[PDB]
Design a protein around this nucleic acid. Sequence first.
DNA 1: CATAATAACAATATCAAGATATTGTTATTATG
Length: 320
Amino acid sequence: DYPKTGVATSIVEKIERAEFNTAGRKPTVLLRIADFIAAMNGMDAKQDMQALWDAEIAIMNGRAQTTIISYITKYRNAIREAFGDDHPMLKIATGDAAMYDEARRVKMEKIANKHGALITFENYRQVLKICEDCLKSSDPLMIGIGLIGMTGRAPYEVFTQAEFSPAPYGKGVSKWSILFNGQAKTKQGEGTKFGITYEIPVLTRSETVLAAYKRLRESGQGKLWHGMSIDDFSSETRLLLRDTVFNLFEDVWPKEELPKPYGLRHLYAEVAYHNFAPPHVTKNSYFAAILGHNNNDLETSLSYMTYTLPEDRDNALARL
DNA sequence: CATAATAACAATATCAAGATATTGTTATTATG
């Protein structure tokens, strides 16, 4: 209760921008958050805080649990922005503890189901070739896609904040590996890849990737993308990227699902493990190494194992 | 009447075991 007044400038600016729009939805949630932070101003009693949060929770009732959790993240971030990390509301404005447990349960359950039913990525070579061809395109979006397919970085990392640099092999450059900076979703942890330049494998010669990236950065849309926030990047590119991926790998992607930009990261993991993995490491370890995870974290890699390579599928049936 | 824009709505994958930050889908709105 040290600060009793505050303003979440993010939401407010997002509303002022949306005051004059040609079309689209009405920012109802942003409005509820704004009115929330507004009502929070001047409060010193915690019972009324609890009542406010009880009503606000009572609002988003007939919705999805994931949606509710995400919205709670929104509210909490708004509170942190407006007042600070010392406000009692942060201990009040949180989700029911039995909700997060159900979430975790469902998550690990899904992963477990995916691990018992791997998808055979039969035409993966064609996809890799498609990305490699996108590496030589003049459309920055395409170059971005191909970069996702080849270096395996996330769309946010690739389009907004990647720094690929030549990796030395003793003396000269490495043909099948580059350097990378910086990782996303790290939240600035002690043992995360925050501000860490580490070596990653690539699925085509390093000169080609470096060239395509150098072209990507110096473009107009590339400059428009650099340093962008996640919401900005979303509203700017998300649907276009989605439909371009939709149209690209239309008839070469596994029939069990639809082409999504993040599948290229999974395929990157599987293939680079299939080609470059040393004999004294496990799959989880190599995955954690090349994907850049928290220190001593091998469970996050479990979410990246959903595909199975045709050759493995073949020689596994060789035991007949 | 489609039509495109827009944010609600939703799920996944990370750092840390209690949530945050990314990626992914659809209903609404103004408008032409």
